[PDB]
Amino acid sequence: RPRFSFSIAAREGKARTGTIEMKRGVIRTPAFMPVGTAATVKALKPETVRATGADIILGNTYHLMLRPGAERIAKLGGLHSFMGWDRPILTDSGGYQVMSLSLTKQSEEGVTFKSRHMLSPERSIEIQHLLGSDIVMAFDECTPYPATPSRAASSMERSMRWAKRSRDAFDSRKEQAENAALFGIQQGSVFENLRQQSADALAEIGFDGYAVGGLAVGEGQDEMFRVLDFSVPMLPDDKPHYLMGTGKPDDIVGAVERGIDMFDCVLPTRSGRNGQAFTWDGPINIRNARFSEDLKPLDSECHCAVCQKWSRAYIHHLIRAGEILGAMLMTEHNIAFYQQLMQKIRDSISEGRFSQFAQDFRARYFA
Amino acid sequence: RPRFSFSIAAREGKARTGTIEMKRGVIRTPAFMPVGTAATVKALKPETVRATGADIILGNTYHLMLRPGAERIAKLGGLHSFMGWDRPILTDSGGYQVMSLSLTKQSEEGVTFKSRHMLSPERSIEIQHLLGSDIVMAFDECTPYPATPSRAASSMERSMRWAKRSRDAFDSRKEQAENAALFGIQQGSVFENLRQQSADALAEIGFDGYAVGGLAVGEGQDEMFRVLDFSVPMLPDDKPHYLMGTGKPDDIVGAVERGIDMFDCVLPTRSGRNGQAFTWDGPINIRNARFSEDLKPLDSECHCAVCQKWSRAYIHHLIRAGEILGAMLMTEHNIAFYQQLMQKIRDSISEGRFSQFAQDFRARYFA
Ligand SMILES: Nc1nc2cc3[nH]c(NCCN4CCOCC4)nc3cc2c(=O)[nH]1
Ligand SMILES: Nc1nc2cc3[nH]c(NCCN4CCOCC4)nc3cc2c(=O)[nH]1
Ligand SMILES: [Zn+2]
Ligand SMILES: [Zn+2]
């Protein structure tokens, strides 16, 4: 397999389906990436993550540099070996904590977090090298929402300067440049002209893929969709488009309708541990007393191992009792559900009936 | 398979190895039973419990009657169906909480716990029927340690009266009597004459197996062994002997040397979640900083899936980070270790070299 090759097999309107080939494996798109922030997809063995259908998982520069340490992971043979996942890993650059943990001194050089730690385009790229990430994100600044046009512009301009520095850092590291891929991240808040400037800047630098950054930060679905409407067409058509931090199933569906190829969110894992289970008729809260004697599986159509074997009643008991198997079963099902969602999306695009699928999905999910 | 058949295949001194055949499966003895108090062996799927080598698991009348409820579990098709374990289940009778949660009003009729709940020989037997346990324990009173001879005698005499009531309750329930087995529980504290009276009383009533109760309650290994020395020979030789609540690996080994066939303890599961891992060179605490960069598996000889795939360093990180996969991996290994211990015990008895195995095990484990 090549370092990186993205091929589009089918389209319907702005939506597309295809594959990313990398050295550690093939990624089917549109893809959902389970989040493995602390070098584990919470409450799941990697074999189980794979069994649900995941092709790639997400790691995090910020968290892994704090614990257990980037250099330590490298000494131990890299993140893949460490956690026992041998397929592709995408790592975020720490740019989102630059905003969410704002503990912080910011400058053109980078960000200092307070023990004190530094992040910069160069250090972020180096850390992702130490981890051995397959898909490296540029170091950026996720602009807070809401932002004035002036502040959004200043922030986006700094991010584009940091994007160039990330590109150069990545390329100066021979082994990284030859074996991994680098994605740039578009910023510009909700403003069309700034999104355009950012897209132009990123394309001039040149990346393997392009993420839409700065969204899923409280703007709401209407506004996110409005921004995607003009923003995704700005990006190179022949490269993958990654919407960072999205999201709920309806968000994913609408985003694919608008040209997005890649997704990540903690929702299936986190909310799984909190008792929310996704079904084709919408989410349920398994803690609810109405499930105490319900012998049906979490979802009536789901093909996952959890739904093959255990009842709502049992999982209800486990979650109420705070039992670890509760978290395990809920999380496996929720991740399996998301992967079944992506599979149905890929198949419907391949067959030219994605518009109808979107319509059918929503009618039932929000009944 | 029969309702219950215990066959002894080999002996060495007081130790023996053989099988218990029941309708839901065969139990190899000496056996270790993982504890599944809240209708789950904590942090493990039943398939994983089986993969470690377990033939039978332990459930608890007291806990399951409180949550989720005995009648509810019965309406849902029984404990096996509920939790997804289709092999034998032994349930304790609630007799040990009669002492540990002493919240309690006690009388010849039974025990009232405070919502208020009642337990008695008749109610305990009924609850274990509702759960669908394969091996039912008689309702007893675990005498506190230390106890005066007079108080130990009074308590033991009440337990023997309760043993008769349990026998009669069990036999009056046709489906239970035809499909499950009933074990009596010896009491009498550390006093030889009272242990003898209890054994005589239990044998006169007649049970499928006999447990040594009232031990592993703070008496220490020397005293426990001293009591086992004269107590186990009092029990019917041709029936299984179950030492309740034991224990550490050295306790198990010495107990088998003294004629015990069956064991249960929370140690591998509970201490597993707390970071203690069992190895042939003794337990280690994986939280210790010395394991932060240790690439070796938890144990160098262990055949479990955990030791095949992940390092001490990774599990150290997970446990320090409070990650659920940490508990999962530690628990799987610890239960696998206990089952490997039992297997080595069975094989050494079969080959007439158990004495040597005991000696070799201790020399290395306590080096
Ligand atoms: N480097 C980089 N990473 C991003 C990551 C993002 N994540 C989100 N939204 C979701 C945030 N989650 C919500 C659930 O709790 C955890 C944080 N929005 C995100 C935006 C970015 C971004 O612009 N840059
Ligand atoms: N019905 C009945 N059940 C028993 C259960 C016993 N368990 C123990 N010792 C271990 C207690 N564990 C120690 C670890 O924390 C949980 C309780 N000792 C036990 C003794 C009995 C007994 O005499 N009767
Ligand atoms: Zn499912
Ligand atoms: Zn192991």
From Swiss-Prot, chains A, B:
Cofactor note: Binds 1 zinc ion per subunit.
Gene Ontology biological process: queuosine biosynthetic process; tRNA wobble guanine modification; tRNA-guanine transglycosylation
Cofactor: Zn(2+)
Signal peptide: none
One annotated GO molecular function: metal ion binding
One Gene Ontology cellular component: cytosol
Keywords: Glycosyltransferase, Metal-binding, Queuosine biosynthesis, Transferase, tRNA processing, Zinc
Residues annotated for Zn(2+) binding in this entry: C302, C304, C307, H333
This enzyme's EC code(s): 2.4.2.29
InterPro entries: ArchSynthase1/Queuine_TRR (IPR050076), TGT (IPR004803), TGT-like_sf (IPR036511), tRNA_ribo_trans-like (IPR002616)
Recorded catalytic activity of this chain's protein: 7-aminomethyl-7-carbaguanine + guanosine(34) in tRNA = 7-aminomethyl-7-carbaguanosine(34) in tRNA + guanine
Gene3D superfamilies, sorted: Queuine tRNA-ribosyltransferase-like (3.20.20.105)
Region (RNA binding) location: 245-251, 269-273
Binding site for substrate: D92, S93, G94, G95, Y96, D140, Q187, G214
Pathway as given in its UniProt record: tRNA modification; tRNA-queuosine biosynthesis
EC category name: transferase
Lineage top rank: taxon: Bacteria
Entry annotation: catalytic residues: D92, D264
Stored HAMAP family: Q_tRNA_Tgt
Subunit structure: Homodimer. Within each dimer, one monomer is responsible for RNA recognition and catalysis, while the other monomer binds to the replacement base PreQ1.
Protein purpose: Catalyzes the base-exchange of a guanine (G) residue with the queuine precursor 7-aminomethyl-7-deazaguanine (PreQ1) at position 34 (anticodon wobble position) in tRNAs with GU(N) anticodons (tRNA-Asp, -Asn, -His and -Tyr). Catalysis occurs through a double-displacement mechanism. The nucleophile active site attacks the C1' of nucleotide 34 to detach the guanine base from the RNA, forming a covalent enzyme-RNA intermediate. The proton acceptor active site deprotonates the incoming PreQ1, allowing a nucleophilic attack on the C1' of the ribose to form the product.
Similarity comment text for this entry: Belongs to the queuine tRNA-ribosyltransferase family.
Full protein name: Queuine tRNA-ribosyltransferase
Species of provenance: Zymomonas mobilis subsp. mobilis (strain ATCC 31821 / ZM4 / CP4)
